Amino acid sequence: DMLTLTRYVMEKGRQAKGTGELTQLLNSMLTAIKAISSAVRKAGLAHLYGIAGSQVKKLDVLSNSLVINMLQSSYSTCVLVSEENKDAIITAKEKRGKYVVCFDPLDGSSNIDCLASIGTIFAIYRKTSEDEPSEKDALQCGRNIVAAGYALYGSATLVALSTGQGVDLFMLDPALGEFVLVEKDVKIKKKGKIYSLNEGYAKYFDAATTEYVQKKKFPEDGSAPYGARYVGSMVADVHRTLVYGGIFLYPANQKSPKGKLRLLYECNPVAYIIEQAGGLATTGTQPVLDVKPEAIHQRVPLILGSPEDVQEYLTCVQKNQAG
Amino acid sequence: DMLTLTRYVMEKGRQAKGTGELTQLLNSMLTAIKAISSAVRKAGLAHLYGIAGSQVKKLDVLSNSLVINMLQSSYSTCVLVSEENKDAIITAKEKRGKYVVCFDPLDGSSNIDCLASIGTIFAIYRKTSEDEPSEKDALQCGRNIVAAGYALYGSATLVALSTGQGVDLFMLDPALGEFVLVEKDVKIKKKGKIYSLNEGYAKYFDAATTEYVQKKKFPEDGSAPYGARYVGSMVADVHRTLVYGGIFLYPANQKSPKGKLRLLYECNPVAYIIEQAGGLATTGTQPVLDVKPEAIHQRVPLILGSPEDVQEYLTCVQKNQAG
Amino acid sequence: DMLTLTRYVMEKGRQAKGTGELTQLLNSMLTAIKAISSAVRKAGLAHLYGIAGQVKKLDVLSNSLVINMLQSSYSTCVLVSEENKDAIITAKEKRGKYVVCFDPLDGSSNIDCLASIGTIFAIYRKTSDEPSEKDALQCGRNIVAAGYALYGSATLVALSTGQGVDLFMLDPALGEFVLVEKDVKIKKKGKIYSLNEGYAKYFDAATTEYVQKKKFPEDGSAPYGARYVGSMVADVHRTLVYGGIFLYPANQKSPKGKLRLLYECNPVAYIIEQAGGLATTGTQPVLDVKPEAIHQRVPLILGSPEDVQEYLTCVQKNQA
Amino acid sequence: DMLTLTRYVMEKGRQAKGTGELTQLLNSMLTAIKAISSAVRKAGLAHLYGIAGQVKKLDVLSNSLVINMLQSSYSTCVLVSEENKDAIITAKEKRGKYVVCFDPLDGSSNIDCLASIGTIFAIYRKTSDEPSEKDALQCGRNIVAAGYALYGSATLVALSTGQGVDLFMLDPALGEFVLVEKDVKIKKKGKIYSLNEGYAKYFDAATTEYVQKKKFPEDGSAPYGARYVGSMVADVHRTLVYGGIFLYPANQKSPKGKLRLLYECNPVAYIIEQAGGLATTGTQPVLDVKPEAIHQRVPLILGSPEDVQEYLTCVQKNQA
Ligand SMILES: Nc1ncnc2c1ncn2[C@@H]1O[C@H](COP(=O)(O)O)[C@@H](O)[C@H]1O
Ligand SMILES: Nc1ncnc2c1ncn2[C@@H]1O[C@H](COP(=O)(O)O)[C@@H](O)[C@H]1O
Ligand SMILES: Nc1ncnc2c1ncn2[C@@H]1O[C@H](COP(=O)(O)O)[C@@H](O)[C@H]1O
Ligand SMILES: Nc1ncnc2c1ncn2[C@@H]1O[C@H](COP(=O)(O)O)[C@@H](O)[C@H]1O
Ligand SMILES: O=P(O)(O)OC[C@H]1O[C@@](O)(CO)[C@@H](O)[C@@H]1O
Ligand SMILES: O=P(O)(O)OC[C@H]1O[C@@](O)(CO)[C@@H](O)[C@@H]1O
Ligand SMILES: O=P(O)(O)OC[C@H]1O[C@@](O)(CO)[C@@H](O)[C@@H]1O
Ligand SMILES: O=P(O)(O)OC[C@H]1O[C@@](O)(CO)[C@@H](O)[C@@H]1O
């Protein structure tokens, strides 16, 4: 149908009978994403190196400033939570709208020096309180998400987006400057053949994780072992899980007893995308989306992917937790 | 000094007192790399999806055709070996020059659908025979390399290049259309803290590999376990090894008794780069660069990286091989 | 505050309390423009020249881009293009209420010299019945939105929806048009005249007399400067931003004039008048001409209102 | 076969048996041009307009790009720029044998209207001593290489090193200039004249008479067409590719003419003559003018040789 993300998002807003407020917020985020893609790809690098006679922190700050300014100037927001800011950012009264956005503007930027795929992750909620906006409006369960997505700056730039009717994939055509729809209503495989986690924490794994990893490598059913992949950049690993199937894990371990990854702006957004595509996303003890947030930078364990694989992991957890 | 790869390569050719033949071959390869970067990033995708009213195999073929045509039309080549062609490609007599090029035009393209970082790898030799050019001119030991490099199409596009005086790193500024020098004479750390291999082959590992992996996760020296990373795209994993240190392994295993990766156009080029940067690259039994090629698509085991780490692995190999 | 043309257009649609149909049509046109800009700047040329082993092709491509984008908007019923003999009636399934007249790549006969070139469009609401060519034959007064893209040293769009003219520049690093000037107004009187004086031999007495007044003023003022790119969007845009006058009048060899009413003259007239200028055939304001045929030609004189009025005073004076 | 300007320039340097010094200088200029093109097309404009929270700036940027790239080539000793009062003497450490005269962004006074604009350059071998402004004051006959970049609907470079004129187009998707025409030749006689007729009141008798012959021919031929962009590289390029004549003669108000000898007139003269055309002050071929000062102005008439000769016949006829 609509070819471009811009038309697609407009048309979905029309079908939803929206007033245009979420459409503007979505357009704003996606413009920030284009601006980030351009910087990640190093447009203007020659000027930094003295072409006219004249780094990861800078790109983190820039990416964060793109997202904040684009979202605030949309007139659709009241509260923003960023991975880069300690406190919630309350939108000026004059520019205040309905929505709350939790985002990680440039996830993986610590490893930009090796040119690892990196990404931007976001989740959007409606403010449901009647009182003045505060960080509390950001502390909603992931079940309350109105829309969420991620951009992956990989070999090409892609956006995964859901507004509650499945997951759609769009790719940036840089010669045109627009995202183009490449797959509508993507569904994750019921069972995959890839497992994705940092095995350098094997020494610190719980009994469940140790058992599950052993069976990936040494199956007891006569099947071939699963392949391993782990980029170390969440968006890259989660996106491969979506398109190829299998499992991605960052469980609690002895040194990170609450996991590493952040509930509000990493794990909730990807849990929503993955469930929208027919997969599962769990902490090990409940769905990620059912965790009731206590603090805006809260960490949780994360296990997600193909439902048969996530079920297998959960079985290890229950078994090893039982008397 | 020279800022751009183009000036840098010209100036190195001048210092070497070359006739310009290798400079033209290098310029030609780097132009093909720019053209590949553009396609990998999906310029013109909107036209494929019907913007004017009207895939991995296609990009493989395109990338291969860019490299071949650019190299042949340079007038610097006599024989080319590509990962994509069964037989060696003999340059037409009218266009024949001195050099032989072994290349993998788009390494990792099988996994382009998940937007994994991918790359282009090449090694250049001088034809030393007096007889008519043939695949034999491509069967030289890696010790005979005149120049080699790789392009990584990651979050940004980078080229690593060596012509025998260390490794230089260049990044593509897309707004300018030139590669810019970002690090001259890069040296790999003597010891790192990352190990990189597919642990899904644990069931098939030799005793050496099993022992080495166990000590990465469970050290016997009171140190923290190494972190694990494995993108599954060789250029991405090798480049991270270079900039961050540590070890990358694709050893022989029970199902791939000669390894997986290709001697001529994957392993020799990266072995050369890694040794030029002060690391080690071994098959497990000898340096990669000392392997005497028997066939243009020969596979070898590959272990490379920081010298203290590669030494530790080699120690496991010797110990487990001994009576 | 909206910065981008996409947010600007969306916000104006929310203010109009529109259903989103025109907004989608404008988004579609603008996407076509960005695609045309990329092609005009010769993205992918190395592939044409055999790296992996034209003016007609680009006319056809640009026409196909605009047609496809407009039809797939679901907002159109009838299109008129400079490139097509007949009006294009949108398939029933994709039908909406708007009629678009456009020239997808004006000035392309001369691409060879790399002259600035452009895309020109006017949008009408269908009034009635069952769609046909007649729906495209409304006078310019009935325009709902119009503008142009100029592919010059940078790519710019001039757009009006009835509340003045806004200017947007394409940032090719972003892929978005950025608002650079809101509510632009033409100077009351300028210091530049613009016409092909190579047709002097064929001018009417009024044009001859006016041109002579520009070069040899009688009131002690400095003579006007001359500029004529020969590409209509470049010459019209310069007149908008610096002021003065632009003329392609009737002459002995082109008695109806050269420029096309539906997709050249009406759109630029609308923009120039929205900016406080005048646009006339020498008989009538362009926007009041009732069109007789989709590829009809008219004379065109437009620009700063005091300069156009001085010209009309010469036309009226020499009439008998 | 070489396809790219980088390979083309390299191969011509290998054929010349050069040491690589001029080749490096040309690579440096061309890189400056690509950088200027990106800026002119407004890459990064959204950042200027506050996305993350001008004509002078672009003149200065373009001048800095060219100066830096040329100086860091290690191929230059003296530079003359339109933007700098005095010649720039290259630091001893970076010194080479070439002298470059350039206008980094010609036409930029009028960026506002998005007119085509350009970069113009001429390269000389220093003859002697110890570098100074005098090294830049050689006549155009001594040029080793020259050309221009036009930032029009696409970005093009015209380059000659003494063996004719080759044309290259920038493919912005690749970041490389692609050879589009080798050894271009201007038509012997064209059908377009190009000058600002707004200075008619100040023309000499020869110019007045010539312009009248163009509009009112006596031999039954069709009158010439008029084009005048007001941006020198756009008007000169069109004359190269379509033929005819381009004039900025002396007039009462500009008795020395307007255009600058070292970095506007000599470079385009060289290209036009390399292409089989003529370039004259009306007194002398431009390339034979011995320069008196680095920012000196001269009259300029250039183009198809038969049109320039018809003009010179009017100059000589009206001399007394
Ligand atoms: N562009 C869109 N795509 C999908 N759903 C939308 C869109 N716009 C609005 N909606 C739905 O309508 C609700 C109200 O929209 P709004 O009136 O724009 O705040 C949102 O919270 C969404 O659930
Ligand atoms: N651009 C360059 N950079 C580094 N070394 C070069 C370059 N050009 C030539 N050489 C060296 O000189 C040898 C002969 O160059 P050629 O005469 O160009 O075939 C090469 O095989 C290189 O070892
Ligand atoms: N994006 C927009 N910008 C300015 N005016 C608009 C916009 N959308 C709609 N309008 C006005 O509202 C009318 C109806 O809009 P629509 O319901 O989309 O056909 C149009 O014909 C315009 O006059
Ligand atoms: N790239 C080139 N293209 C054409 N002619 C060249 C080139 N390089 C050098 N030449 C000619 O050879 C001379 C000496 O070159 P160089 O040794 O580089 O200063 C120049 O002044 C030119 O006349
Ligand atoms: O090195 P570890 O501890 O395995 O961390 C990797 C994780 O941390 C990040 O926040 C850092 O890149 C995620 O993108 C990723 O999943
Ligand atoms: O899935 P496995 O067997 O671990 O293969 C990965 C290797 O194979 C490739 O040829 C395929 O991407 C290399 O780029 C990479 O190192
Ligand atoms: O050669 P002339 O007759 O002066 O034509 C110029 C006009 O023609 C065009 O349609 C281009 O050929 C317009 O863009 C321009 O104003
Ligand atoms: O306004 P005029 O006097 O006709 O000036 C036009 C000339 O001036 C310029 O230097 C630009 O202002 C040239 O690019 C052009 O040919």
Q: Which long-range contacts (CB under 8 A, 24 or more apart) does D126-130 make?
A: D126/D77, D126/D78, D126/D97, D126/D98, D126/D99
Backbone angles phi, psi at A302, to 5 degrees: -140, 125
Per-residue exposure over B242-272, b if at least 16 CB sit within 10 Å of its own CB, e if not? bbbbbbbbbbbbeeeeebbbbbbbbbbbbbb
Structure tokens at D184: 């271009």
Mutate to test the pocket of ligand 6, among B234, B241, B247 (most ligand atoms within 8 A of CB): B234
Query: Which residue carries 């006007």 as its tokens?
Result: C224
Burial-class residue D56 by CB neighbours within 10 Å (0-12, 13-18, 19+): exposed
* CA A109 to each of CA A68, A233, B246: distance values in angstroms, whole numbers, following the listed order: 17, 9, 20
Amino acid identity for residue A33 in this structure: I
Residue C171 neighbours by CB distance under 10 Å: 27
Mutate to test the pocket of ligand 8, among D55, D105, D106 (most ligand atoms within 8 A of CB): D106
Structure tokens at C97: 């209420």
Which string of DSSP letters, residue by residue, matches chain C?
---BHHHHHHHHHHHTT--SHHHHHHHHHHHHHHHHHHHHTTTTHHHHTTTT--HHHHHHHHHHHHHHHHHTTT-EEEEEETT-SSPEEPPGGGB-SEEEEEEEEETGGGGGGT--EEEEEEEEE-------GGGG---GGGEEEEEEEEESSSEEEEEESSS-EEEEEEETTTTEEEEEEEEE---SS-SEEE--GGGGGG--HHHHHHHHHHHS-SSSPPPPEE-B-S-HHHHHHHHHHH--EEEE---SS-TT-SSBIIIIIHHHHHHHHHTT-EEE-SSSBGGG---SSTT-B--EEEESHHHHHHHHHHHHHH--
Strands C165-171 and C176-184: antiparallel
On chain C, the residues whose CB falls within 8 A of the CB of B43 are 43-44
Of C68, C28, C37, C70, nearest in space to A8 by CA: C28
Mutate to test the pocket of ligand 4, among D161, D163, D183, D274 (most ligand atoms within 8 A of CB): D161
Same domain, C119 and C196: no
Distance, in Å, from the CA atom of C148 to the CA atom of C268, rounded to the nearest integer, reads 8
Distance, in Å, from the CA atom of D74 to the CA atom of B282, rounded to the nearest integer, reads 42
Structure tokens at B82: 């590509």
Of A188, A176, A146, nearest in space to A163 by CA: A146
The answer to whether the CB atoms of A236 and B115 lie below 8 A apart is yes
Q: Which helix (H) or strand (E) holds D171?
A: strand D165-171
Query: Cα D7–D11–D13 angle (5° rounding)?
Result: 120
Atom of ligand 4 nearest to the CA of D17: 12
**Residue of chain B minimizing CA distance to A181:** B49
Helix (H, G, I), strand (E, B) or coil at A304: strand
Q: Which long-range contacts (CB under 8 A, 24 or more apart) does C74-79 make?
A: C74/C21, C74/C24, C75/C21, C75/C22, C75/C24, C75/C25, C75/C28, C76/C25, C76/C100, C77/C126, C77/C131, C77/C135, C78/C126, C78/C131, C78/C132, C78/C133, C78/C135, C78/C136, C79/C136
- The DSSP code for A173 is E
Strands C76-81 and C88-89: antiparallel
First to last CA, chain B: 56
D59 and D104 in contact (C-beta within 8 Å)? Answer: yes
Distance, in Å, from the CA atom of D302 to the CA atom of D183, rounded to the nearest integer, reads 18
On chain A, the residues whose CB falls within 8 A of the CB of B44 are 173, 175
Same domain, B243 and B261: yes
The set of residues, in sequence order, having a beta carbon less than 8 Å from that of D265 and lying 6+ positions away, is D259, D279, D286, D298, D300
Q: Which helix (H) or strand (E) holds D79?
A: strand D76-81
A74 and C2 in contact (C-beta within 8 Å)? Answer: no
Domain-terminating residue out of C152, C184, C216? C184
On chain D, the residues whose CB falls within 8 A of the CB of C154 are 40-42, 114
D93 is in an annotated binding site: no
Same domain, D111 and D10: yes
Atom 16 of ligand 5, nearest CA residue: A234
Backbone angles phi, psi at C123, to 5 degrees: -120, 135
Residue D276 neighbours by CB distance under 10 Å: 16
- Of the listed ligands, the closest to the CA of D229 is 8
Residue A79 neighbours by CB distance under 10 Å: 22
Which string of DSSP letters, residue by residue, matches C200-220?
GGG--HHHHHHHHHHHS-SSS
Same domain, B111 and B206: no
B256 and B281 in contact (C-beta within 8 Å)? Answer: no
Distance, in Å, from the CA atom of A33 to the CA atom of A26, rounded to the nearest integer, reads 11
D103 is in an annotated binding site: yes
Which string of DSSP letters, residue by residue, matches A261-301?
SBIIIIIHHHHHHHHHTT-EEE-SSSBGGG---SSTT-B--
Same domain, B191 and B114: no
Of B175, B89, B69, B85, nearest in space to B135 by CA: B89
Distance, in Å, from the CA atom of A22 to the CA atom of A31, rounded to the nearest integer, reads 14
> Is residue C144 in contact with ligand 3, taking CB distance under 6 Å?
yes
> Is residue C107 in contact with ligand 7, taking CB distance under 6 Å?
yes
The answer to whether the CB atoms of D53 and A44 lie below 8 A apart is no
What is the arrangement of strands in the sheet containing D88-89, beginning at the earlier edge strand? D88-89, D76-81, D98-106, D117-125, D143-151, D155-160, D165-171, D176-184
Three-class SS string for chain B?
CCCEHHHHHHHHHHHCCCCCHHHHHHHHHHHHHHHHHHHHCCCCHHHHCCCCCCCHHHHHHHHHHHHHHHHHCCCCEEEEEECCCCCCEECCHHHEEEEEEEEEEEECHHHHHHCCCEEEEEEEEECCCCCCCCHHHHCCCHHHCCEEEEEEECCCEEEEEECCCCEEEEEEECCCCEEEEEEEEECCCCCCCEEECCHHHHHHCCHHHHHHHHHHHCCCCCCCCCEECECCCHHHHHHHHHHHCCEEEECCCCCCECECCEHHHHHHHHHHHHHHCCCEEECCCCEHHHCCCCCCCCECCEEEECHHHHHHHHHHHHHHHCC
How many H-runs (helices) and E-runs (strands) does chain D carry?
8, 13
Same domain, B50 and B141: yes
> Is residue D106 in contact with ligand 8, taking CB distance under 6 Å?
yes
Structure tokens at B27: 């310029």
Same domain, D180 and D307: no
Work out whether the CA dihedral A273, A276, A281, A285 comes out positive or negative: positive
State the chains in contact with A (3 or more Cβ–Cβ pairs under 8 Å). B, C, D
Of C7, B172, C240, nearest in space to A43 by CA: B172
Distance, in Å, from the CA atom of C297 to the CA atom of C291, rounded to the nearest integer, reads 9
> Is residue B23 in contact with ligand 2, taking CB distance under 6 Å?
yes
- The DSSP code for A41 is T
CATH number of the domain bearing residue D9: 3.30.540.10
- The DSSP code for A38 is H
Atom 23 of ligand 3, nearest CA residue: C144
* CA A266 to each of CA A302, B146, D263: distance values in angstroms, whole numbers, following the listed order: 10, 47, 57
Distance, in Å, from the CA atom of D75 to the CA atom of D22, rounded to the nearest integer, reads 7
On chain B, the residues whose CB falls within 8 A of the CB of A232 are 227, 229
A60 and A103 in contact (C-beta within 8 Å)? Answer: no
Distance, in Å, from the CA atom of D99 to the CA atom of D78, rounded to the nearest integer, reads 5
Same domain, A14 and A152: yes
Q: Is C234 left (phi over 0), alpha (psi -120 to 50) or beta?
A: alpha
Structure tokens at B126: 């001088």
The answer to whether the CB atoms of B43 and C43 lie below 8 A apart is yes
- Measured between CB atoms, which of C7, C34, C43 is closest to A28? C7
Work out whether the CA dihedral A308, A310, A311, A312 comes out positive or negative: positive
State the chains in contact with D (3 or more Cβ–Cβ pairs under 8 Å). A, B, C
Helix (H, G, I), strand (E, B) or coil at D193: strand
Distance, in Å, from the CA atom of C275 to the CA atom of C158, rounded to the nearest integer, reads 11
Same domain, A5 and A145: yes
Helix (H, G, I), strand (E, B) or coil at A322: coil
Distance, in Å, from the CA atom of C10 to the CA atom of C12, rounded to the nearest integer, reads 6
Structure tokens at A168: 């759609």
> Is residue D187 in contact with ligand 4, taking CB distance under 6 Å?
no
What percent of chain A is helix, strand and coil (3-state, nearest 5)? Answer: 40, 25, 35
On chain C, the residues whose CB falls within 8 A of the CB of B65 are 52-53
CATH number of the domain bearing residue A295: 3.40.190.80
Helix (H, G, I), strand (E, B) or coil at D5: helix
| Domain count for chain D | 2
- The DSSP code for A138 is G
**Residue of chain B minimizing CA distance to A159:** B115
Same domain, B314 and B252: yes
Q: Which helix (H) or strand (E) holds A185?
A: strand A178-186
Annotated binding site of B for AMP: 9, 19-23, 98-99, 126
Structure tokens at D1: 């076969």
Structure tokens at A289: 């989306």
Per-residue exposure over C242-255, b if at least 16 CB sit within 10 Å of its own CB, e if not? bbbbbbbbbbeeee
Resolution in units of Å: 2.0
> Is residue C237 in contact with ligand 3, taking CB distance under 6 Å?
no
What are the beta bridge partners of residue A67?
none
Residue D125 neighbours by CB distance under 10 Å: 16
Structure tokens at C134: 């007649």
Work out whether the CA dihedral D137, D140, D144, D150 comes out positive or negative: positive
Q: How many interface pairs between A and C have CB atoms less than 8 angstroms apart?
A: 72
Q: Which helix (H) or strand (E) holds A181?
A: strand A178-186
Q: Which long-range contacts (CB under 8 A, 24 or more apart) does D313-319 make?
A: D314/D206, D314/D207, D314/D209, D314/D210, D314/D213, D315/D206, D315/D282, D315/D283, D317/D206, D317/D209, D318/D204, D318/D205, D318/D206, D318/D209
Of B61, B242, B69, B86, nearest in space to B149 by CA: B242
Burial-class residue B230 by CB neighbours within 10 Å (0-12, 13-18, 19+): buried
Work out whether the CA dihedral C236, C240, C243, C249 comes out positive or negative: positive
Burial-class residue D285 by CB neighbours within 10 Å (0-12, 13-18, 19+): middle
Work out whether the CA dihedral C291, C292, C296, C298 comes out positive or negative: negative
What are the beta bridge partners of residue A108?
none
- The DSSP code for D261 is I
Of A300, A260, A273, A268, nearest in space to A284 by CA: A300
Structure tokens at B249: 């392994």
B91 and B79 in contact (C-beta within 8 Å)? Answer: yes
Of D143, D138, D174, nearest in space to D296 by CA: D138
The set of residues, in sequence order, having a beta carbon less than 8 Å from that of C101 and lying 6+ positions away, is C79, C80, C81, C121, C122, C124, C136, C262, C263, C266, C267, C294
Structure tokens at B86: 């069964």
Helix (H, G, I), strand (E, B) or coil at D123: strand
A25 and A74 in contact (C-beta within 8 Å)? Answer: yes
- Measured between CB atoms, which of D14, D35, D174 is closest to B34? D174
Of D26, D31, D88, D24, nearest in space to D62 by CA: D31
First to last CA, chain A: 56
Same domain, A174 and A31: yes
Distance, in Å, from the CA atom of B176 to the CA atom of B193, rounded to the nearest integer, reads 36
Backbone angles phi, psi at D253, to 5 degrees: -85, -25
Helix (H, G, I), strand (E, B) or coil at D184: strand
Distance, in Å, from the CA atom of B91 to the CA atom of A188, rounded to the nearest integer, reads 47
Atom of ligand 8 nearest to the CA of D106: 14
Distance, in Å, from the CA atom of A78 to the CA atom of A95, rounded to the nearest integer, reads 8
D112 and C241 in contact (C-beta within 8 Å)? Answer: yes
Domain-terminating residue out of B159, B185, B211? B185
The set of residues, in sequence order, having a beta carbon less than 8 Å from that of D313 and lying 6+ positions away, is none
- Of the listed ligands, the closest to the CA of B163 is 2
Residue A49 neighbours by CB distance under 10 Å: 14
Widest CA span in chain D: 67
B117 and B111 in contact (C-beta within 8 Å)? Answer: no
> Is residue C225 in contact with ligand 8, taking CB distance under 6 Å?
yes
> Is residue C180 in contact with ligand 3, taking CB distance under 6 Å?
no
Structure tokens at B240: 């991270």
The answer to whether the CB atoms of D14 and B19 lie below 8 A apart is yes
The set of residues, in sequence order, having a beta carbon less than 8 Å from that of B36 and lying 6+ positions away, is B63, B66, B67, B105, B106, B120, B151, B153
Amino acid identity for residue A47 in this structure: H
Mutate to test the pocket of ligand 3, among C161, C168, C179, C274 (most ligand atoms within 8 A of CB): C161
Burial-class residue B141 by CB neighbours within 10 Å (0-12, 13-18, 19+): middle
Structure tokens at A153: 């700056």
> Is residue D230 in contact with ligand 8, taking CB distance under 6 Å?
yes
Domain-terminating residue out of C184, C208, C235? C184
The answer to whether the CB atoms of C35 and A74 lie below 8 A apart is no
Annotated binding site of B: 9, 19-23, 83, 98-99, 104, 106-107, 126, 198-201, 230-234, 250, 260, 266
Q: Which helix (H) or strand (E) holds D271?
A: helix D266-274
Atom 5 of ligand 6, nearest CA residue: B232
State the chains in contact with B (3 or more Cβ–Cβ pairs under 8 Å). A, C, D
Residue D53 neighbours by CB distance under 10 Å: 10
**Residue of chain B minimizing CA distance to C32:** B51
Method: X-ray
**Residue of chain C minimizing CA distance to A39:** C173
Distance, in Å, from the CA atom of A269 to the CA atom of A288, rounded to the nearest integer, reads 10
Atom of ligand 6 nearest to the CA of B109: 12
* CA D142 to each of CA C62, C71, C317, D122, D125: distance values in angstroms, whole numbers, following the listed order: 45, 59, 58, 10, 8
B257 and B284 in contact (C-beta within 8 Å)? Answer: no
Structure tokens at B148: 């080699």
The answer to whether the CB atoms of D52 and A69 lie below 8 A apart is yes
- How many Å lie between the alpha carbon of A305 and the closest alpha carbon of chain B? 14
Give the CA radius of gyration of chain A: 20
B248 and B303 in contact (C-beta within 8 Å)? Answer: yes
Of B92, B109, B91, nearest in space to B100 by CA: B91
Question: How many angstroms is it from A26 CA to the middle of ligand 1?
Answer: 10
* CA C202 to each of CA B76, B187, C282, C298: distance values in angstroms, whole numbers, following the listed order: 61, 77, 16, 16
Strands B194-196 and B247-250: parallel
Domain region containing C239: 185-318
Query: Which residue carries 């509508």 as its tokens?
Result: A184
Same domain, D36 and D84: yes
The answer to whether the CB atoms of D180 and C228 lie below 8 A apart is no
Distance, in Å, from the CA atom of B157 to the CA atom of D251, rounded to the nearest integer, reads 55
Distance, in Å, from the CA atom of D175 to the CA atom of D128, rounded to the nearest integer, reads 38
A171 and A3 in contact (C-beta within 8 Å)? Answer: no
Q: Is A75 left (phi over 0), alpha (psi -120 to 50) or beta?
A: left
Query: Cα A161–A166–A171 angle (5° rounding)?
Result: 35
Distance, in Å, from the CA atom of D121 to the CA atom of D124, rounded to the nearest integer, reads 10
Backbone angles phi, psi at B181, to 5 degrees: -65, 120
A281 and A301 in contact (C-beta within 8 Å)? Answer: no
